[PDB]
DNA sequence: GGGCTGTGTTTGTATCAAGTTACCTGAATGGTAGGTGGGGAAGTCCAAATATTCCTAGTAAGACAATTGCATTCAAGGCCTGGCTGGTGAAACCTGTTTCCTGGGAAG
């Protein structure tokens, strides 16, 4: 049937910073399974952040704390500020 | 002509730290899983991406073990690993109780 | 199906070649009876955790995500096969 | 009757990873009961920064060894070359990679 | 307000195999927090067993597999058979 | 197991030292809690039998 | 509030007494500048993970379950204080 | 009269493997946390059960370190630990990158 | 002075992937109504942090003594390397069977 994936959304990032670059099949699955794992670390730490503060709600604040825990040092400085651009751009729209 | 001991050896270290090949072969590792699986449930099947999920996880452990073994061998003013090193490598990580 | 003498299938160069990937120059002759022991400990803590997933869905084939789920359990994540 | 132009929420935030697909993987994964409208936006950005940062570094090692495509050895070697990317994936085996080239500089020949 | 606990249900087990034994306050909290941790390991592995087999249902089969994973060796032989007594006794009642 | 170590050291109540010492005395109980610190316990009595006096 | 020279608060006998609990008879005089270093590495990976919990609930007090949640994260579980 | 070296030392090993006392004192460990916390957020308060949650976790690490240090010192035909042991103790577990 | 293994450069094709699309359905969006959850502002009370001294215990230090650790030399064992033989592993080929694989369906 249908296997959902993140394979298509890699070519929309691979062709942003290296537009003359292909990527193999068996290397797609790593960047596929990199996403699904780094998804459920951030979600599965934001999930356990909901119980620790007695709320049933995953806000966009709780994903920010569950990225300042998993990412160390200098990635935790960029991937926070690479999200709050994509939210402030999002909320000024619609 | 005649290599000294430690010359063909050091050619192997820069060789195998470059490739990505399979070191443990397939069928003499596939049959190893057909010994341990027989206890817990007889007549099991295996997908070949699951055996390969072990052949790239067992080789992910010994290389993680031997590189932490060789720290001990250098630590005892030696260049030779010994089975007193591994049995003390694993006691530090807690990988054997 | 029973096929014995296959902890002895991890041959003498194939432990030396694994030793060379770790950055090891000189080895003893008594690692070979240590490595086969530490290897079968590691496969009696993965296959024992993998089969309880495959029995739970009543499957007869331990599939590719099963082993990855077992390695998820121990804290040694394997990418590239799914999961 | 017809309706307006369906503008995807990935294009309304300037991202590439979807927000429609992430927002049904926060309500079918039992993470919580309510999921805000901004949370799969903010999470698809952090999935998009970290997907670049490997492939930025995976592009260089492909180039430095004269390759067009990125094979997993480059992903093996882009990780563990960067320090802070390694501390994220410190427990993680990458399939078909081998290790970094390393000698402890005591085994050098005499 | 109310802090739920497992402290009372320890004295109903401590006075089963050592009836002449007290237990201190700061040792109660260990056996309190032993329970809450070994609770959410078994639940939080039975939870992730629900997604792996596409069911919304935690059965009493799924708790049995999430005890044969967390408990090693000889505890996994007893705590399975110390549950299926307490279920077969339960279901023959009511 | 925490009742026995209380009894073997002549105690009525079980203080956490006994819980520290009931764990890591049993083998299979230790492999469950191999990563786990117990508060206010210290360790088992242990010497490597090389440091014995000469 | 700033109070310096308190990595030097881990005094010379109190590292020796910790050495005696590990089962160590004879020590060097250069462990004292190694232990204070390895200790402050371990508290710059717990307080850095604890404060991000306390800031997240907008609390000003890093409470008892916070540190246990930080030690939950690293894989070194602490019983006895909750969590 | 005059003890030999290694006699008052071995009295300490059976002493401190029996007690449950605090070895690192409170206030010269409480003030250590008032140096590392100042970077990440100034003006924080601490509950005394959280400082004690660190004083029984830092002492849970060094004792776990020194008992895995002393394996190395015995391993190099020695009875003395050295700071080349700890820096090779931590590289085996992966406690320092 | 010479040699060996690693390394590089160029070609062709097979394979793998890149490409574009056709549809078709799945899912992704738009517009709305509703309630609920959470967020925000407040207050008495609560827990920790400080200013203090006081005393005491162990910390810090100076001296001394002896063991251990180190550096060297001695002795040989163990392991590395290579010239060789062959047994199996793997790759290519063929399949029947078995299991799944959701999916639908019947019946008690
Ligand atoms: Mg009937």
Author numbering:
A (entry chain H), E (entry chain D): 29 to 122
B (entry chain A), H (entry chain E): 39 to 135
C (entry chain B), G (entry chain F): 20 to 102
D (entry chain G): 9 to 118
F (entry chain C): 65 to 118
Give the authors' words.
Integration of the reverse-transcribed retroviral genome into a host-cell chromosome is catalysed by integrase (IN), an essential viral enzyme (reviewed in1). To carry out its function, a multimer of IN assembles on viral DNA (vDNA) ends forming a highly stable nucleoprotein complex, known as the intasome. The nucleoprotein complex from the prototype foamy virus (PFV) contains only a tetramer of IN, making this well-characterised intasome an ideal model to study the basic mechanisms involved in retroviral integration. Herein, we employ a combination of cryo-EM and single-molecule Förster resonance energy transfer (FRET) assay to understand what impact retroviral integration has on the structure of the target NCP.
Following isolation by size exclusion chromatography, the intasome-NCP complex was incubated in the presence of Mg2+ to facilitate strand transfer. We then used cryo-EM imaging and single-particle approaches to determine the structure of the resulting post-catalytic assembly to 3.9 Å resolution. As previously observed, intasome engages the strongly preferred site on the nucleosomal DNA, at SHL 3.515,24. According to the atomic model, at the integration site, DNA is lifted by 7 Å from the histone octamer and bent to allow access to the IN catalytic centre, in excellent agreement with the earlier observations based on the crystal structures of the PFV strand transfer complex and the lower-resolution intasome-NCP cryo-EM data. Intasome engages nucleosomal DNA non-symmetrically at two distinct sites: at the strand transfer site, as well as at the opposing gyre, which nestles in the cleft between one catalytic and one outer IN subunit. Near the integration site, the C-terminal alpha-helix of histone H2B makes direct contact with the C-terminal domain of one catalytically competent IN subunit, providing corroborating evidence for the previously reported role of PFV IN residues Pro135, Pro239 and Thr240 in engaging the C-terminus of H2B15. Furthermore, the higher quality of the new cryo-EM map allowed us to build a backbone model for a segment of the N-terminal H2A tail, revealing intimate contacts of H2A Lys-9 and Arg-11 with the IN C-terminal domain. Concordantly, truncation of the first 12, but not 8 H2A residues lead to a reduction of intasome-NCP complex formation. Furthermore, Ala substitutions of either H2A at Lys-9 or Arg-11 affect complex stability, while a combination of the two substitutions fully abrogated stable complex formation under conditions of the pull-down assay.
